[PDB]
DNA sequence: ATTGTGGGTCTTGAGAGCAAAAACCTG
DNA sequence: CAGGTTTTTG
RNA sequence: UCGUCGGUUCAGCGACGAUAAGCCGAGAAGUGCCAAUAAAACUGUUAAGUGGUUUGGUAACGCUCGGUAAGGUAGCCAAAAGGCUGAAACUCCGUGCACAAAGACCGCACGGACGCUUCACAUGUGGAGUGUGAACCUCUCAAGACCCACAAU
């Protein structure tokens, strides 16, 4: 069972006003980042603690005997439970679970030095486990979201009789997971309420689970932003990138131009020390950012989605961990990792396997007479095979190699 | 007002023994820093229910509580270290009551401190610069059977030959420097902080 | 422009996206 | 009692 | 040329705002100003003398939370309360259900038409999907590299 997410738009809450319902999530959210860093507060004290009892008496202490409970988690909820009191005591414990499973996952990492203490940022997520949230469709075709934000003390401090309800703006591909959410299709998982600062919106993010030979080869192209290419088929395809280079023209001018000015003097940009100076290229960045995640998205979709148009139940690509050293591709300084990121899920959506291979001599080596050349590619855009004399896009021909099956160990008894 | 040199070979000694004394300095140096940062923790009274008396501050107590078990560091580097720690703890004491920041750590390659006492530099006929750095303590000179001052070759030239030789000079003062090790680079540096007018 | 120092951000990765029992409120 | 709703802990 | 709204991200379209790369308000760890020299390390028989620079209170240049322009909306009855009516956002028509200023309303459902883009069959017919087009797992934290201020050059 795979977890996805998806965002609907809190428009208005019902029974209360907007001051009421921005003042609670404020706070709430005060709560959760105090939640967090205390909770992993205290996972350090233990174990700083944990070791000096080893050094003293020669084993672990045992924190039921201690804490009073047996894991760090009892002890934090015990210890947050005072301060933390406005918050739902569901959200408040998923919180601190948080804190503390980031803290134990990664604690040799932080006891060799390798790893910093986790510290939390003011505009977190408040968390909302999976039964704090319940969604109604209204007859006239409304969604209500009714969340448990509060707890008993919070509900009679700010006299909230019930569950806090609030209009959600359910259309498009949201109606759709929510609609089947409603039908029981997709259950609901522990899920979060954010706030986009850009457009001053709160969002509920409901993340949701549920039930979900031929081999392509993927190349990041030199002259063509992505290629891929099949085996057992001669099949092409391709995704340039005109949008990519114009955008980039843009942004690059916009960045060059922002940082020009920034060093002019300016009065009331200038007055705050910081957040003002960096709004501006914070804004300008923050579209470079999700333009590239929308780009990665439509790329990943096309890949797939002419995996199961060739029927390929394979996907293989790039290992970039040794690319970044050559880093001389069609896209400069992209987003390689989200992009596959964004290809291994959506392939497992599909249903197929995805493996990454070591880019050793792919573009070097023809897919042909199988043949690797250091000289063999003569130009920057056409693939000429001597051997052979094979004449092909040099893309082409890379993908052709990552799409064939054990192409990497190929190539590595090639080489020896 | 910082300046690094990074340092070919130590002039006393060989390359495998040096480092093997800078990564255990480099050892004592972050248990300290830990250890200062739990102690500073526990002397602002941020302790928990089921978790000392006599001493000024709790640099003091850090200290004392340290010297045992860091007897490799010079006695000036251990203070310099626990003063570093204490310090980040007294700076960022609000927000770890309020639970804004957690608490403070501190890097493995962590930077090995000498404090103004333990650096010095001179210049060869040669044209080698040589500087002369106190690193470890009497327990740990019969131990490891070395010399106080370590000599090292450090490549200077460019800023760095003027900066050096304006410490040479007497124009720049040496104040308390760092030795710090680069894995991508994988080199031994010196970084010297000079103060003047 | 190049080495560093003192304060902030990209691109890579990783982990996650709780469950059960009981007391309180409610019906 | 009955059933959600919090709360607390493994 | 850049933004705002029209559900989410990137484009388009409609209507708007730009001195917003703009202006402004309060609190507060850095920085500065007062007292104030605490740890710790040395030389030195000790003494003594050095480097070292701590603890509180202030301000606010820098710092932390903020504010600030941006689509459009139909009136009566009733002493009043309340009632009736039913305006306005990304195709049109009909019905039904909603709704009197409003960060919170302009919506939804069904049926028909029109347009689009996909398939199937012999330009045409049938079937499918959708109303500007394409997509629509994110959050958190760390690491490595990048940005701003400073010293030498
Ligand atoms: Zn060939």
Not at chain 1, 139 to 166: C, F, T, W
Not at chain 1, 244 to 253: A, D, H, K
Not at chain 1, 328 to 338: H, I, M, P, V
Request: net charge positive; glycine share 6%; aromatic share 10%.
């Amino acid at each position: 069972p795979m977890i996805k997410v998806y965002r609907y738009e809190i428009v208005k809450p019902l029974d209360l006003d907007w001051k009421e319902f921005g003042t609670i999530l404020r706070q709430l959210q005060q709560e959760t980042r105090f939640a967090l860093n205390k909770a992993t507060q205290l996972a350090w004290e233990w174990m700083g603690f944990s070791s000096d009892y080893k050094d003293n008496h020669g084993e672990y202490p045992k924190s039921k005997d201690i804490l009073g409970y047996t894991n760090v988690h009892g002890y934090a909820y015990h210890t947050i439970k005072t301060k933390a009191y406005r918050l739902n005591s569901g959200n408040l414990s998923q919180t601190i679970k948080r804190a503390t499973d980031r803290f134990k996952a990664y604690q040799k990492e932080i006891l060799r030095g390798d790893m910093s203490i986790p510290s939390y940022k003011r505009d977190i997520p408040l968390d909302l486990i999976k039964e704090n949230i319940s969604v109604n469709r209204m007859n006239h075709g409304d969604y209500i979201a009714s969340l448990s934000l509060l707890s008993n003390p919070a509900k009679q401090e700010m006299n909230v009789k019930r569950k806090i309800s609030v209009i959600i703006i359910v259309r498009g591909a949201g109606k759709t997971i929510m609609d089947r959410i409603l039908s029981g299709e997709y259950q609901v998982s522990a899920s979060q309420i954010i706030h986009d600062d850009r457009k001053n919106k709160w969002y509920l993010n409901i993340s949701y689970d549920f039930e979900p030979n031929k081999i392509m080869g993927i190349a990041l192209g030199v002259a063509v932003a992505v290629y891929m290419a099949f085996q057992h088929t001669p099949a092409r395809y391709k995704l340039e990138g005109g949008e990519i280079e114009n955008f980039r023209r843009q942004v690059e001018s916009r960045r060059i131009s922002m940082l020009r000015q920034g060093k002019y003097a300016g009065g009331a940009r200038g007055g705050h020390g910081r957040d003002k100076r960096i709004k501006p290229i914070e804004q300008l960045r923050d579209k470079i950012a999700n333009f590239r995640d929308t780009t990665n998205h439509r790329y990943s979709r096309y890949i797939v989605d002419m995996a199961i148009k060739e029927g390929c139940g394979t996907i293989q690509m790039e290992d970039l961990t040794n690319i970044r050293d050559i880093g001389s591709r069609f896209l400069q300084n992209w987003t390689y990792y989200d992009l596959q990121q964004k290809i291994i899920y959506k392939a497992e959506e599909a249903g197929i396997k995805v493996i990454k291979i070591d880019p050793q001599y792919t573009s070097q080596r023809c897919s042909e007479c199988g043949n690797i050349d250091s000289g063999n590619r003569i130009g920057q855009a056409i693939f000429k095979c001597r051997a052979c004399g094979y004449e092909a896009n040099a893309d082409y021909n890379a993908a052709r190699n990552i799409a064939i099956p054990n192409i990497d160990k190929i190539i590595a008894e090639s080489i020896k | 007002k910082v300046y690094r040199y990074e340092i070919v070979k130590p002039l006393d000694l060989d390359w495998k023994e040096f480092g093997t004394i800078l990564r255990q300095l480099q050892q004592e140096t972050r248990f300290a820093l830990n250890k200062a940062t739990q102690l500073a923790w526990e002397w602002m009274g941020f302790s928990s229910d089921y978790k000392i008396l006599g001493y000024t501050n709790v640099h003091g107590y850090a200290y004392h509580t340290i010297k045992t078990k860091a007897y490799r560091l010079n006695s000036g580097n251990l203070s310099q270290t626990i003063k570093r720690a204490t310090d980040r703890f007294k700076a960022y004491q609000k927000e770890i009551l309020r639970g804004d920041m957690s608490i403070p750590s501190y890097k493995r390659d962590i930077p090995l401190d000498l404090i103004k006492e333990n650096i010095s530099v001179n210049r060869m006929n040669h044209g080698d610069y040589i500087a002369s750095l106190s690193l470890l303590s009497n327990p740990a000179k019969q131990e490891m059977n070395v010399k106080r001052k370590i000599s090292v070759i450090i490549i200077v030239r460019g800023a760095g030959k003027t900066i050096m030789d304006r410490i040479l000079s007497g124009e720049y003062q040496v104040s308390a420097s760092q030795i710090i090790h680069d894995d991508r680079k994988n080199k031994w540096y010196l970084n010297i902080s000079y103060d003047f007018e």
